[PDB]
Structure 1
Amino acid sequence: APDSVDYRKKGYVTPVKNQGQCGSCWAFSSVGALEGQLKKKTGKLLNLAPQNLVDCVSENDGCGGGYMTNAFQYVQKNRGIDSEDAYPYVGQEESCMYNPTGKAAKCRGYREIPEGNEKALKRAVARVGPVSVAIDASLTSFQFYSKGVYYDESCNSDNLNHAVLAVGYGIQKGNKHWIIKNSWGENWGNKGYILMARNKNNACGIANLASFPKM
């Protein structure tokens, strides 16, 4: 496998977004993975609409949480997802207002990484593109992260409470990491990103609920 991967350097990753007071991290994670596949397939990088997912994925709970796999299935069965420009993010729940004229991507299904398998996650990032993952982001240590490779041995791999996007991996001064795009704005972390420990016993459950869309 490649020793390091960073899809930001390939033009597969849109700017960091800010979910606001709505618990829609799952929707941001899902749009990020769809954005990466759309760029890889077509050469177009475009912001896709997390609001489309928040309002329209009936199997999820809007601002109360959701699964990325349900989001991918919705895009597949709906035969589309809007661009952000066609369906802007408002950070609150509302009726589904999907508009097929603003459709910007389709999905042919989704794939899951075997639970707990960081090597498989690394293979997916290398061969597929950015991957949607869920983690335990509840610790104040995560909340106040600024730089370096984040590792907290007290993180719980079974407490998956936040969804983010794995856009790469590498090693910094001997510490293997995942490059993670969050949705807490650019003023959080390192310009909106965090490096999370890799191959440290599935730290924070990073490989427990990982998936990507087919396009």
Structure 2
Amino acid sequence: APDSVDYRKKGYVTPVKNQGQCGSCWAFSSVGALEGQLKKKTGKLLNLSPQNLVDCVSENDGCGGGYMTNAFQYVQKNRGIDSEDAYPYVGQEESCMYNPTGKAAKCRGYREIPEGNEKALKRAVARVGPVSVAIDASLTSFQFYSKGVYYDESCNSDNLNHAVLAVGYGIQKGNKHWIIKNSWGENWGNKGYILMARNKNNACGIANLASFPKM
């Protein structure tokens, strides 16, 4: 694996979105990983529909939370996910309005990264593309992050409450990091991104629930 990777530089990453008040981070994370694999497979980058997931992944709880693995399985069994344009985001739950004419990507299942293994997560990011991950995003320090490599010893790897997208990894001023795309808008963090401590004992649980879709 290369010493550093950044898929944003390779056109695998769509603009930062804003989930708003709805608890649909799992949908945005899922969409981002799907977006990356679509670009890799077909050469086209497009916005896929988190709302399709919120509304249609029946076992998840819409704006009340969910798992990315269930999202990927839906896209597989559904034989599609719509584009954002075909099924735009409204940030509240509603009945399922999936339309196959709006389909922009398919899924052949998913793979999970071994729990807690940041070495495995690095290798996956390097080999595959952006990877969906869950973290503890509950600390004030995370909420108001602006710059640098994020670390707070109060971060609880057993409190996975937020889904984000690992789009790369690297080092800054001698401290290794993951490059993380959030879905709290471009005004959050550093233009919507946060660098999170890497190889510091799985800080914030970053490798505890990582997965990516097969395409």
TM-score when scaled to structure 1? 1.00
How far residue 142 of structure 1 moved from its aligned partner, in angstroms, is 0.2
- Unaligned stretches of 5+ residues in structure 1: none
Structure 2 counterparts to residues 1-215 of structure 1, below 5 A: 1-215=1-215
CA separation in 1, counterparts of 2:180 and 2:81? 23
How far residue 180 of structure 1 moved from its aligned partner, in angstroms, is 0.1
CA separation in 1, counterparts of 2:154 and 2:17? 28
CA separation in 1, counterparts of 2:21 and 2:153? 28
CA separation in 2, counterparts of 1:181 and 1:214? 20
Residues 153-192 of structure 1 deviation map (CA, whole Å, 9 limit, x = unaligned): 1100000000000000000000000000000000000000
CA separation in 2, counterparts of 1:82 and 1:155? 35
How far residue 29 of structure 1 moved from its aligned partner, in angstroms, is 0.1
Percent of residue pairs bearing the same amino acid type: 100
Aligned residues: 215
For the residue of structure 2 that corresponds to 1:176, the secondary structure is: strand
CA separation in 2, counterparts of 1:43 and 1:191? 25
CA separation in 2, counterparts of 1:193 and 1:10? 16
CA separation in 2, counterparts of 1:166 and 1:44? 20
Residues 45-102 of structure 1 deviation map (CA, whole Å, 9 limit, x = unaligned): 0000000000000010000000000000000000000000000000000000000000
For the residue of structure 2 that corresponds to 1:116, the secondary structure is: coil
CA separation in 2, counterparts of 1:75 and 1:135? 23
For the residue of structure 1 that corresponds to 2:70, the secondary structure is: helix
For the residue of structure 2 that corresponds to 1:16, the secondary structure is: coil
CA separation in 2, counterparts of 1:21 and 1:111? 29
Residues 109-145 of structure 1 deviation map (CA, whole Å, 9 limit, x = unaligned): 0000000000000000000000000000000000000
For the residue of structure 1 that corresponds to 2:63, the secondary structure is: helix
TM-score when scaled to structure 2? 1.00
CA separation in 2, counterparts of 1:144 and 1:21? 17
CA separation in 2, counterparts of 1:60 and 1:111? 19
For the residue of structure 2 that corresponds to 1:62, the secondary structure is: coil
CA separation in 2, counterparts of 1:136 and 1:37? 25
What is the root-mean-square deviation of aligned Cα atoms in Å?
Answer: 0.3
- Unaligned stretches of 5+ residues in structure 2: none
CA separation in 2, counterparts of 1:168 and 1:211? 14
Residues 6-36 of structure 1 deviation map (CA, whole Å, 9 limit, x = unaligned): 0001000000000001000000000000000
